[PDB]
Structure formats: structure tokens, C-alpha cells
Enzyme design. Structure first.
Site, PDB file in Angstrom:
ATOM      1  N   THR A   1       0.592  -1.237   0.130  1.00  0.00           N
ATOM      2  CA  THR A   1       0.454   0.227   0.346  1.00  0.00           C
ATOM      3  C   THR A   1       1.088   0.843  -0.074  1.00  0.00           C
ATOM      4  O   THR A   1       0.695   2.040  -0.691  1.00  0.00           O
ATOM      5  CB  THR A   1      -0.990  -0.024   1.036  1.00  0.00           C
ATOM      6  OG1 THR A   1      -1.361  -1.135   1.397  1.00  0.00           O
ATOM      7  CG2 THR A   1      -2.128   1.019   1.126  1.00  0.00           C
ATOM      8  N   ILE A   2       1.836   1.464   1.006  1.00  0.00           N
ATOM      9  CA  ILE A   2       3.078   1.926   0.962  1.00  0.00           C
ATOM     10  C   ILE A   2       3.850   2.793  -0.509  1.00  0.00           C
ATOM     11  O   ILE A   2       3.634   3.334  -1.022  1.00  0.00           O
ATOM     12  CB  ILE A   2       3.810   2.141   1.360  1.00  0.00           C
ATOM     13  CG1 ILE A   2       3.387   2.289   3.282  1.00  0.00           C
ATOM     14  CG2 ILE A   2       5.021   3.029   1.878  1.00  0.00           C
ATOM     15  CD1 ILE A   2       3.909   1.746   5.096  1.00  0.00           C
TER      16      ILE A   2
ATOM     17  N   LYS B   1      -5.615  -2.400  -1.378  1.00  0.00           N
ATOM     18  CA  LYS B   1      -7.008  -1.524   0.419  1.00  0.00           C
ATOM     19  C   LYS B   1      -7.709  -1.245  -0.524  1.00  0.00           C
ATOM     20  O   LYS B   1      -8.350  -0.414   0.267  1.00  0.00           O
ATOM     21  CB  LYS B   1      -5.806  -0.982   1.360  1.00  0.00           C
ATOM     22  CG  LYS B   1      -5.458  -2.733   1.671  1.00  0.00           C
ATOM     23  CD  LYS B   1      -4.739  -1.696   3.480  1.00  0.00           C
ATOM     24  CE  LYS B   1      -3.547  -2.550   3.803  1.00  0.00           C
ATOM     25  NZ  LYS B   1      -3.157  -3.141   3.339  1.00  0.00           N
TER      26      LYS B   1
ATOM     27  N   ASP C   1     -14.047   1.665  -1.916  1.00  0.00           N
ATOM     28  CA  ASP C   1     -14.745   2.022  -2.748  1.00  0.00           C
ATOM     29  C   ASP C   1     -14.488   2.178  -4.479  1.00  0.00           C
ATOM     30  O   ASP C   1     -13.549   2.388  -4.277  1.00  0.00           O
ATOM     31  CB  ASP C   1     -15.252   3.543  -2.507  1.00  0.00           C
ATOM     32  CG  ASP C   1     -16.715   3.861  -2.476  1.00  0.00           C
ATOM     33  OD1 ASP C   1     -17.640   2.914  -3.069  1.00  0.00           O
ATOM     34  OD2 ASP C   1     -17.190   4.699  -2.256  1.00  0.00           O
ATOM     35  N   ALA C   2     -15.403   2.566  -4.927  1.00  0.00           N
ATOM     36  CA  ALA C   2     -14.987   2.744  -6.524  1.00  0.00           C
ATOM     37  C   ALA C   2     -14.216   1.260  -7.032  1.00  0.00           C
ATOM     38  O   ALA C   2     -13.020   1.469  -7.701  1.00  0.00           O
ATOM     39  CB  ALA C   2     -14.341   4.044  -6.778  1.00  0.00           C
TER      40      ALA C   2
ATOM     41  N   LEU D   1     -10.991   1.185  -9.376  1.00  0.00           N
ATOM     42  CA  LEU D   1      -9.980   1.253  -8.770  1.00  0.00           C
ATOM     43  C   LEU D   1      -9.300  -0.656  -8.895  1.00  0.00           C
ATOM     44  O   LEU D   1      -8.452  -0.298  -9.912  1.00  0.00           O
ATOM     45  CB  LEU D   1      -9.545   1.668  -7.256  1.00  0.00           C
ATOM     46  CG  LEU D   1      -9.328   2.735  -6.670  1.00  0.00           C
ATOM     47  CD1 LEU D   1     -10.071   2.490  -5.715  1.00  0.00           C
ATOM     48  CD2 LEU D   1      -8.315   3.594  -7.334  1.00  0.00           C
TER      49      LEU D   1
ATOM     50  N   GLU E   1      -9.249  -7.965   2.728  1.00  0.00           N
ATOM     51  CA  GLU E   1      -7.824  -7.934   3.271  1.00  0.00           C
ATOM     52  C   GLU E   1      -8.823  -7.511   4.892  1.00  0.00           C
ATOM     53  O   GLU E   1      -9.184  -6.713   4.972  1.00  0.00           O
ATOM     54  CB  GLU E   1      -7.543  -6.183   3.679  1.00  0.00           C
ATOM     55  CG  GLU E   1      -5.476  -6.543   2.542  1.00  0.00           C
ATOM     56  CD  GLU E   1      -4.985  -6.761   4.201  1.00  0.00           C
ATOM     57  OE1 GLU E   1      -5.239  -6.467   5.060  1.00  0.00           O
ATOM     58  OE2 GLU E   1      -3.518  -6.643   3.678  1.00  0.00           O
TER      59      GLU E   1
ATOM     60  N   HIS F   1      -4.548 -10.423   9.228  1.00  0.00           N
ATOM     61  CA  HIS F   1      -3.325  -9.526   8.962  1.00  0.00           C
ATOM     62  C   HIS F   1      -3.301  -8.328  10.271  1.00  0.00           C
ATOM     63  O   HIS F   1      -4.316  -8.022  10.878  1.00  0.00           O
ATOM     64  CB  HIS F   1      -3.828  -8.301   8.196  1.00  0.00           C
ATOM     65  CG  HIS F   1      -3.302  -7.192   7.453  1.00  0.00           C
ATOM     66  ND1 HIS F   1      -3.042  -6.807   6.589  1.00  0.00           N
ATOM     67  CD2 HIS F   1      -1.817  -7.132   8.422  1.00  0.00           C
ATOM     68  CE1 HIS F   1      -1.462  -5.978   6.459  1.00  0.00           C
ATOM     69  NE2 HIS F   1      -1.210  -6.209   7.703  1.00  0.00           N
TER      70      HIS F   1
ATOM     71  N   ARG G   1      -0.124  -3.152  11.397  1.00  0.00           N
ATOM     72  CA  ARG G   1       1.286  -3.156  12.532  1.00  0.00           C
ATOM     73  C   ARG G   1       1.610  -2.109  13.148  1.00  0.00           C
ATOM     74  O   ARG G   1       2.158  -2.523  13.816  1.00  0.00           O
ATOM     75  CB  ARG G   1       1.673  -2.262  10.905  1.00  0.00           C
ATOM     76  CG  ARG G   1       3.149  -1.317  11.100  1.00  0.00           C
ATOM     77  CD  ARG G   1       3.748  -0.451   9.452  1.00  0.00           C
ATOM     78  NE  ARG G   1       3.888  -1.444   8.654  1.00  0.00           N
ATOM     79  CZ  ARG G   1       5.235  -1.625   8.010  1.00  0.00           C
ATOM     80  NH1 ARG G   1       6.217  -1.444   9.122  1.00  0.00           N
ATOM     81  NH2 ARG G   1       5.431  -1.827   7.265  1.00  0.00           N
TER      82      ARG G   1
HETATM   83 MG   LIG Z   1       0.541  -5.074   2.101  1.00  0.00          MG
END
Ligand SMILES: [Mg+2]
Ligand SMILES: O=C(CO)[C@H](O)[C@H](O)COP(=O)(O)O
Ligand SMILES: O=C(CO)[C@H](O)[C@H](O)COP(=O)(O)O
Ligand SMILES: [Mg+2]
Lengths: 215, 213
Positions: free
Chosen positions: B34-35, B62, B65-66, B70, B110, B134, B137
């Protein structure tokens, strides 16, 4: 105090976004880098937009789900004023984003596009979150979900809890009266401005309606 | 055997390449974290698939919406898989899955932060076949450990018919907690990227998976 107007830039490339901003930057209050643009171009979109429009509030709609500190810092280092965190994020993800935001004299909004609970809303307040985005999903809207009674009730309750509430999700000009009498902080319009025949006149219509309804 | 995925949670492509140039051949799945999705945008997916076309490329976007929009952007950039966050509207997950099928790819839900067993059933009824279990973090950083409640929840998800991915600051030593469960993928990010020897870290993971499964 009148609801402000935010334009959502849900464009896939910067040049598509600029076709809108060159028309309406001075006709709206907040310029949002939409999630679609953040994903299309990355965080350069925030930096470039803020450089063009340094006098405006620039919002990075990153919908941070985890790694709150790292993702918020990337947005703020790109000169964002506000960032969004998704409502299902761990509470420490919200706190971490807020801590960074405070270092940059910015702010965090919680994006309510999920399932979420009133206990979680209280957790956001205790954490010092002061803004939520009440969001009708784009995909729910496409599956026929309309604005309804339950939405009004929830918005009022969030406001009463002490949040500044933003309202969004396929807003059309004719939807504004549904919200009259509620101290809405911001209305977001994406498609209803960008895709209008005259984006300038669409934004001015929203502004006139708001001035009537809340004046 | 459970597959091995490396998470590229880097802010720039050149930083990611410091890792892939060592370990791309030592893993099964290369994840655009994601980063990296936020740092570089969808070009990260396009570039990494062009480099490693024989590997599964996961865009960890992640999606909240949309879904159709996406997901299409990720799949047009040659992603194999994409992630949708667990609190997305059910129509978002369905939207992203419909697009994924056009491209012969797949969607993973996720499971970071809050979700319910009712939603898990919804995903299953929608045709979703993959979840990512998950440990956040930020939860890890606040002292949240892996525990038996996590193992029970993984087994439950597996029994519902999901292929389960396990992730969240995984160390080599963590692998035996999951023995006996048909884990689809283990993700390692920090424990591979930040190891003194990323190649040895990856091979140790594969070796231990081979022992245990
Ligand atoms: Mg990841
Ligand atoms: O976060 C979003 C989904 C959009 O940016 C926002 O909700 C408004 O755009 P639209 O008016 O086109 O729904
Ligand atoms: O989405 C993520 C959080 C990471 O990409 C994933 O969890 C693997 O990273 P790490 O092993 O460093 O936690
Ligand atoms: Mg938005």
C-alpha cells in the site's frame, strides 16, 4: 456557518484533474486529491496540486487502513492539509495519523465508507478526531442505495458527538435540501461538478443553493 | 505448499528494487505494498510485472470504494491480484471481483482492523475466495501479539472455503503457530527486506515451509 464546498478530483491522471481545477479552483473551498488520483499518480498529486493552489485546503483522500504514521507522513511531506483514515482501521492507526498531522499543523478525517459502530465513533472522539466523512458508497449508489432517513439520523448524531461532518457520495444539487437544518461542515461534489457541461456554473449552483438553505 | 510473498512497502521504485534485485527469484509473489501504491501509483504494478512477469504481482491497494474503477486501474497495469479492505461495501468487493474475472485475476479481502463473521459469509456468497488475515502494523506496534484466537479465526476462515494469507510482522519463528492449516500464502515484508541477508531470510522461510507442510 455555511457548509463549504469540496471538489473531489477522482481522476486517474494529473492532466485530467487539471482540466477540472483550471476551471473551478477559485469556485470551491477544498481541493481533494481523490483516492483514484492518489492511486493513479501517487503522492506527487498532492505536492503538485498544493503548489498550484497554495492558498487552498488540499485534502489527500488516502483512506489509510494501516501504517498510519508512515502513510500520513508521506501525504504531509507532500504538503497535504488534511488526510483520510478509513473507519475500520485499528484505533492506533488513527492516532498515529493524527500525531503526524499535528506535527504539520494538519488534520485527519475518518472516512465512514464501511460498516462501523457507535463505540468506534466514541473511540475516535476520545482520540481527538474532530472530522468524519459520511459517505454513501459509489458502488452502493450504483446498486440503487438512495439517501434516506437513517442517514439523516446518523449524521445528526455524529454532529451531536462533536464531529464536523462532511457529506458525500454522488451528491446532486437536488439532494442538498435533505440536509437542511443540520450544521454540515462540507459537501463534496465529484461527478456533479467535473462532468457537468459547465463545471464553473455547477459549482456556483451548489454555492447558491447552500447560501439559501443555510443562510 | 504455502507460497511465499514479499511485501514491497517502499516509498519509491528504486527503493523497492534494492529488494527485488536480491530476492525476486526466491519468492512466489511480489507485492506492491500500500505504501508503494501511494508513493508511486499504479506505475509500480506495471513496472514490477514487466520485470517479473513469471511471478504473481499483487497490488495491495486496500480498495475501500469505487471497486470497479480502482480494480480496473490495477488490472490494466497488469496486476494478478488486488486487495479490497474488509469494511468496503459489499458492492465494492463484488465490483472489483467482476473486473478481476475479466482479466483472469483475483481479489483478496484484507482483514485489517474491524470486521464480522457475517461479513465473511457475505464475501463467500459473493464468490470471494481469498482473505488476508492481517495483524495490523500499528496494533503490533502497540504490543498486540499473535495468539490462539488468531489461529482459531484462521482455521474458521479456511473451513468457510477461503484461501487464507497470513501476515503482520511475521518472523521465521512464527511459522509453527500455523502448522496443520492449509495456509495459501505467508507474507514477509520487514523480515525479508530488512534482514542482514535478504536471500538467506527468504530461503529460510521456504525451507521451514517445506519442513512444516
Ligand atoms: Mg501489504
Ligand atoms: O471518496 C469518494 C468516493 C468521492 O471522491 C466523493 O465521495 C465524491 O465524489 P462523487 O460526488 O462523484 O461521488
Ligand atoms: O500490508 C502490510 C501491512 C505489509 O505489506 C505486510 O503485513 C507484510 O509486511 P510485514 O511483514 O513488514 O508486516
Ligand atoms: Mg474522495
Amino acid at each position: 456557518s455555511l457548509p463549504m464546498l469540496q471538489v473531489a478530483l477522482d481522476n486517474q491522471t494529473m492532466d485530467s484533474a487539471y482540466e477540472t481545477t483550471r476551471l473551478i479552483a477559485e469556485e470551491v473551498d477544498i481541493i481533494e486529491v481523490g483516492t483514484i488520483l492518489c492511486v493513479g499518480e501517487g503522492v506527487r498529486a498532492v505536492r503538485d496540486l498544493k503548489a498550484l493552489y497554495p492558498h487552498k485546503i488540499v485534502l489527500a483522500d488516502a483512506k489509510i487502513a494501516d501504517a498510519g504514521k508512515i502513510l500520513s507522513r508521506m501525504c504531509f511531506e507532500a504538503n497535504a492539509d488534511w488526510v483520510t483514515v478509513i473507519c475500520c482501521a485499528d484505533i492506533n492507526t488513527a492516532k498515529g495519523a493524527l500525531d503526524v498531522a499535528k506535527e504539520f499543523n494538519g488534520d485527519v478525517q475518518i472516512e465512514l465508507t464501511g460498516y462501523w459502530t457507535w463505540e468506534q465513533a466514541q473511540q475516535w472522539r476520545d482520540a481527538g478526531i474532530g472530522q468524519v466523512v459520511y459517505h454513501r458508497s459509489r458502488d452502493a449508489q450504483a446498486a440503487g442505495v438512495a439517501w434516506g432517513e437513517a442517514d439523516i439520523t446518523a449524521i445528526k448524531r455524529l454532529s451531536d458527538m462533536g464531529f464536523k461532518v462532511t457529506v458525500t457520495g454522488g451528491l446532486a444539487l437536488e439532494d442538498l435540501p435533505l440536509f437542511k437544518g443540520i450544521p454540515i461542515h462540507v459537501f463534496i461534489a465529484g461527478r456533479s461538478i467535473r462532468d457537468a457541461a459547465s463545471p464553473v456554473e455547477a459549482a456556483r449552483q451548489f454555492k447558491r443553493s447552500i447560501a439559501e438553505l443555510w443562510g
